[PDB]
User: Fold this.
Amino acid sequence: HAVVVAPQRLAEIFNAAPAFAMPPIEDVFYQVASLFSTK
Amino acid sequence: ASHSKSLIWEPRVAVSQTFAEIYSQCYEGFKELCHLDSRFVPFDATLFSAQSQEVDRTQMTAEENAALDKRVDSFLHLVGSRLRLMPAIKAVEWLIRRFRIHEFNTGTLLATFLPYHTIPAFVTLLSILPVQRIPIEYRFLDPYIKSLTPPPRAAIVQQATNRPDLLSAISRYTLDSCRAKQEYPGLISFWGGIMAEAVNGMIDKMRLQQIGPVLSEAMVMKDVPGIQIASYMVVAILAAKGSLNDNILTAFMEQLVHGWTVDTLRPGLVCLTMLAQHRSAKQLSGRVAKAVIKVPDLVSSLRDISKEHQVDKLANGLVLAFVDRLAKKGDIRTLPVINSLLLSELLQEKQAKVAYKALLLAAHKIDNIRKQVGSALVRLSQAEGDVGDAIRTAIQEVDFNIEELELKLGA
Assistant:
């Protein structure tokens, strides 16, 4: 049942660089999915 | 007049320029873009041809304008990957000076520049847009137009969170790019982060059938893996925050496996673990089961994923889905799948136990095939470790005797 996450924590992931200089979308996916994990 | 608006030359210089001057300087930027990417070469006969220096838009019919609009929109999608380069700015400059695309195409122009909203060029674009033509969904940019400073990324996020028409506008542009194979990494990452933060916002505040069709179309762009994966992010967050019911969780899973490819296979898999983890129903559909067992060494793949996520409900739903298929068509091909999944140690005790009990009644339910299911029942009851303990306790509780089967299978 759901996950409690702070909007600041999801916002760190997409503020490390401008869109053009971000890690591959695969690495960003893993970060985000790990932040919303059930354990 | 309006001739002084320019991305490159300051108003005092730009007002005096002839179209020949502008053309010969901007044309050099376009031919440098051609040397980098042949897809620009078609436009050498239309938007950037010699004839174009004289073309007066106001003398075109309503179709001719609409055809010009389409060529311009197409070019904008193509040039979007190179707006950090001066030759790209020079090519856009030509379209602005000669076809006034900052008047007739200002929505496409703005969306093209939006992933670059932190570079000086973006503030320079803002400084020449005719405000009267900026679409409603971009008027949150008004304070940055007056102060001539870059909009922080949290302004874009917060407007897209609160006003779906910007979100819908970023998405539409991104997807038209993908469909036209004019996408580029920065566009995929930008739409991904805006869509993630926004949808996380949209739900966080309310404690969504407008972005449904967008996620679903992205999940099946086999030629654009980045868009597929980026939509896996959003679909992850959605499900991971109690935000969806069981029937729509299933349709996302169904759409995921229906469009995934080898390049998206691992992120798609961890997304499937999250989707099923928040289903209240236990048994996954047939379509997902049939597609998930095509992962080479599925068991070791979920065990790798288990060091960050919980895999037990994907695992459980698979076994029941295959047990159910054996109960209903007596297909011995399910027995290797059930067996390797049960023994995987990814289920939990009571999951295994109802898995096994359900397997027993599935055997009972069909009227050789009794030989292999019986033998599979027996092999499982002798398994060395925890799963075997559960399978045995489960056999005690059901008042089933393996032994007469053990012996009847012998004879």
About this structure: Residues 1-411 of chain B form one domain. Chain B is about 65% helix and 0% strand. The CA atoms of residues 240 and 274 of chain B lie 7 Å apart.
